[PDB]
Nucleic acid binder design. Structure first.
Ligand SMILES: Nc1nc2c(ncn2[C@H]2C[C@H](O)[C@@H](COP(=O)(O)OP(=O)(O)OP(=O)(O)O)O2)c(=O)[nH]1
Ligand SMILES: [Ca+2]
Ligand SMILES: [Ca+2]
Ligand SMILES: [Ca+2]
Ligand SMILES: [Ca+2]
Ligand SMILES: [Ca+2]
Length: 901
DNA sequence: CAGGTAAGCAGTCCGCG
DNA sequence: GCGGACTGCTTAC
């Protein structure tokens, strides 16, 4: 097989590389890598190296990496550019793997671990590591085994061995319900004392050294705790055995308010699953406890136990250990679904970076572009200092707040990356500038043509047309990948709808799910067999289709995020290719494109309708338009349609056969106007929206910019079995909105859009009547809690104290003195409830850690003093009032003359 | 910690005769 | 109590 790296490090003048050799074996080597850097040289100097601008360079080969780094410093002292890849391990990887890396995941050791630490005096701080580690479960991907290290004797209690037999039993049998599919994969090791446990763990770690290391909060908790505990018991040299090169570094992670400590283990790639999830999931969660996320992702119930975790080991060691094992498995289950590790490996190897660098689009693109340029013997410029400067972004149209019955939307495929490719925007393709006219002059096509030679953006920039820039070239490659995976995602989605349809008429038989590839549209034969299947088989097929869709989603949306990150990186001062001229060329072209096409669509539709000056485009954001289709439907007449699907078909046909060709002609003219390199503005129909045929539903409404709701029947070619709400920006979409309130507001909107005013009034009246029975967690608001200290003045709110911080301070006084009570963690999320006047907490609200029950100490008092009236008005009535006034609708029945009978 | 700008709403402080 | 200046938080792109 072709070799591939696992990890790479620079340690002094050596590269330390772990890799898979040509036989599939893991190896480690130390290489005295001699780096090269570059300086500009005279035109007469014969060379094959040129900077990105075509200026000749001489290569300087250094005796060692320190020599190279010192040379960079001296070049700064002289005042001359030091060119080339200054991150020497990226240069090493580029030299050693001068080919597209094909990796074999089965050979990469992926470790998933979790530790338990009993502590009677509050949260066990990793930097202190003052309490024994009493459990470790460490899953190894190569062995496919859960290795369980269990401390039986501790200063906090001596316990009996964990029983695998009890662990397997149902909760109703007194067991722990450790999933049957992992029972045979557990390797259980009990220990008489902690020193022995840790020594054996380290020997095990040396035998089975993780390449990728993951788990839940491992970077912020498990890794520093294990490192510091071992350091405290045995000394530093022993703790450094966690690194295969015996090198570690305390790394300070700092933001705008305070800092924290993590341990860098050289020769290991740590991908904490919480961070993978936050980056790659495109969710924003009220809580990031593993319990909360597992419930959300997997629909598994929380692991229940009696009493605090600080007493769980002594009271019920059996469950304590079973829960440690299940916690490790839950991360594996989430990954089986989301495939973030696979994503990271894909992106890391593609870029030729340390895998953990996938968190940084700047580093990722720096490496992609360097490797691309190196292929041509071109030489990357030195990174420079730039002051942070604001720059303009997208255009967003101000909508007229209203109901909108029939709506068709369109938006550009990969807008910003497509603009980059179309205009040819790149550091080395800048050709000059032209004298700019006001933006509206380009939008209305009255401005002088910018250039008859170069490709232009209405910010004044001109670009070469003779050859593609490296940014367009490399962005196109990742775009093509994204497009492939999105194809699979949408096929899986359409396949899901077929199954949902079939589930209306399930067959009374015993059978199996069909063995099919859900990434491809079902054939006629498959469709026929599906129509003959049982509910059991259909539901299994739906589950599989939906898992396939999720896998496609992960692969596509994060490749989209990467390419969009390149457009953004051009406006990030830490990017090697930072240039506000290029960043603004993208954003300003986008503003033009949107407003240009708004004009063209209006002109086209006024033509086909025989009107003048009428606004068909009601809204737009960045690269999208929302077109009122009422007059189109009305031109045929509603009574001509057999059912909802009939007019959806008609609008779909109108969009594809009339709208899109007109849109395309408008954009081709714009491309010619700007003299662009290639027409790539592809604005395809997104949504077809409207009320169900014959209903009193309103179809959709807008309250303002970035705040709307649509009843969608077809989304990017997926024809839904049941209408789906596309809701953007409204409170139903915000993690800060109480769970039960999101649900109720969503139902109000569904009723507005699908059923009408009377239906809405019926639901509101019921909700208002019953909501006091809702569980306190379901009606609590959520907020991130930053700067708790700033606003804390002797335990009381300081000037300008935010509402949620006030709540936290109220909580702190209420639990004061308790070493055991859960503390609110700076920067994490809290639940927030308002409190009735004259409550014993002495303030108008209380807040506590999100994803948790409030401590039993005060729970009864919170429940008793909760202000339901305020809660209802702020989270429910006020947003609903916003929706209904916008839609010109009443959520309460107004008086009428009929009342007099 | 890690990636760009636009823009919405909650809430504080305080004016507004 | 609404509106502005401001902070804080959170979404749409
Ligand atoms: N830097 C950055 N830019 C974004 C992000 N989301 C959207 N944008 C910018 C770049 C996009 O091209 C543009 C339009 O947003 P869209 O959500 O419609 O994405 P895009 O057109 O790229 O892909 P699409 O084919 O519509 O799925 O807005 C983001 O998360 N980061
Ligand atoms: Ca635990
Ligand atoms: Ca788009
Ligand atoms: Ca599309
Ligand atoms: Ca059937
Ligand atoms: Ca869009």
């Amino acid at each position: 097989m072709k070799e591939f790296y696992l990890t790479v490090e620079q340690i002094g003048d050596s590269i330390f590389e772990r890799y898979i050799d040509s036989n599939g074996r893991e190896r480690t080597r130390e290489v005295e890598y001699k780096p090269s850097l570059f300086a500009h040289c005279p035109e007469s100097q014969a060379t094959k190296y040129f900077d990105i601008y075509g200026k000749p360079c001489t290569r300087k080969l250094f005796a060692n990496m320190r020599d190279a780094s010192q040379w960079i410093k001296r070049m700064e002292d002289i005042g001359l550019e030091a060119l080339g890849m200054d991150d020497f391990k990226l240069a090493y990887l580029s030299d050693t793997y001068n080919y597209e890396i094909k990796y074999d995941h089965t050979k990469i050791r992926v470790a998933n671990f979790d530790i338990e630490v009993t502590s009677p005096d509050g949260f066990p701080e990793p930097s202190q590591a003052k309490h024994p580690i009493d459990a470790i479960t460490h899953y190894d991907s190569i062995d496919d085994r859960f290795y369980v290290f269990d401390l039986l004797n501790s200063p906090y209690g001596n316990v009996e061995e964990w029983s695998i037999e009890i662990a397997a039993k149902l909760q109703e049998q007194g067991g722990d319900e450790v999933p049957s599919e992992i029972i045979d994969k557990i390797i259980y090791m009990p220990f008489d004392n902690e020193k022995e446990l840790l020594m054996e763990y380290l020997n095990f770690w040396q035998q089975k050294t993780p390449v990728i290391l993951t788990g839940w909060n491992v970077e912020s908790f498990a890794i520093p705790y294990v490192y510091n505990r071992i350091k405290n018991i045995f000394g530093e040299s022993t703790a450094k055995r966690l690194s295969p090169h015996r090198k570690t570094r305390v790394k300070v992670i700092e933001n705008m308010y305070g800092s924290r400590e993590i341990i860098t283990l050289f020769g290991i790639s740590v991908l904490d699953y919480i961070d993978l999830y936050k980056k790659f999931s495109f969710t924003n969660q009220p809580s990031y406890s593993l319990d909360y996320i597992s419930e959300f992702e997997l629909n598994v119930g929380k692991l229940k136990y009696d009493g605090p975790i600080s007493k769980l080991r002594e009271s019920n060691h059996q469950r304590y250990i079973s829960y440690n094992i299940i916690a490790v498995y839950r991360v594996l289950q989430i990954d089986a679904k989301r495939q973030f590790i696979n994503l990271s490996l894909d992106m890391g190897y593609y870029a030729k970076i340390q895998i953990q660098s996938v968190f940084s689009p700047i580093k990722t693109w720096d490496a992609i572009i360097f490797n691309s340029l190196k292929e041509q013997n071109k030489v990357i410029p030195q990174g420079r200092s730039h002051p942070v400067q604001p720059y303009p972004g997208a255009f967003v149209k101000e909508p007229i707040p209203n109901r909108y019955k029939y709506v068709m939307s369109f938006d550009l495929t990969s807008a910003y990356p497509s603009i980059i490719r179309q205009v040819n925007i790149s550091p080395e393709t800048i050709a000059g500038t032209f004298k700019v006219a006001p933006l509206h002059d380009y939008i209305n096509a009255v401005a002088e043509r910018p250039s008859d030679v170069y490709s232009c953006s209405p910010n004044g920039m001109m670009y070469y047309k003779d050859r593609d820039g490296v940014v367009p070239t490399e962005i196109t490659k990742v775009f093509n990948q994204r497009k492939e995976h999105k194809g699979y995602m949408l096929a899986a989605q359409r396949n899901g709808e077929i199954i949902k349809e079939a589930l209306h008429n399930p067959n009374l038989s015993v059978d199996e799910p069909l063995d099919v590839d859900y990434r491809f549209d079902f054939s006629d034969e498959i469709k026929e067999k599906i129509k003959k299947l049982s509910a059991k088989s259909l539901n299994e097929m739906l589950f599989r289709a939906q898992r396939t869709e999720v896998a496609g989603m992960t692969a596509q949306i994060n490749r989209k995020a990467l390419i969009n990150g390149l457009a953004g990186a051009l406006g990030n001062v830490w990017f090697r290719y930072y240039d506000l001229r290029n960043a603004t060329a993208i954003t300003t072209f986008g503003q033009m494109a949107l407003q240009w096409i708004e004009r063209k669509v209006n002109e086209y539709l006024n033509e086909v309708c025989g009107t003048e000056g009428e606004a068909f485009v009601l809204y737009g954001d960045t690269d999208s338009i929302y077109v009122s289709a009422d007059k189109i439907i009305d031109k045929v007449g509603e009574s001509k349609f057999r059912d909802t699907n009939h007019w959806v078909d008609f609008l779909d046909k109108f969009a594809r056969e009339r709208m899109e060709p007109a849109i395309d002609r408008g954009f081709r003219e714009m491309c010619e106007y700007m003299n662009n390199k290639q027409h790539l503005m592809f604005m395809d129909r997104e949504a077809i929206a409207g009320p169900p045929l014959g209903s009193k539903g309103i179809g959709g409404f807008w309250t303002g910019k970035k705040r709307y709701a649509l009843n969608v029947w077809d989304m990017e070619g997926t024809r839904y079995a049941e209408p789906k709400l596309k809701i953007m920006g409204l409170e139903t979409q915000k993690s800060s909105t109480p769970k039960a309130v999101q649900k109720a507001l969503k139902e109000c909107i569904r009723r507005m859009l699908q059923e009408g005013e009377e239906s809405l009034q019926e639901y509101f009246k019921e909700f208002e009547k019953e909501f006091r029975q809702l569980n306190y967690i379901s009606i609590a608001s959520v907020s991130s809690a930053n700067n708790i200290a700033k606003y804390d003045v002797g335990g009381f709110p300081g000037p300008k104290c935010p509402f949620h911080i006030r709540g936290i301070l109220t909580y702190n006084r209420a639990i004061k003195g308790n070493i055991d009570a859960p503390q609110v963690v700076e920067g994490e999320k809290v639940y927030v409830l308002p409190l009735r006047e004259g409550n014993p907490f002495g303030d108008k609200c209380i807040a506590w850690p999100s994803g948790t029950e409030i401590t039993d100490l005060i729970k009864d008092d919170v429940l008793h003093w909760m202000d339901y009236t305020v809660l209802l008005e702020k989270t429910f009535i006020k947003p609903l009032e916003g929706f209904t006034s916008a839609a010109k609708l009443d959520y309460e029945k107004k008086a009428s003359l009929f009342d007099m009978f």
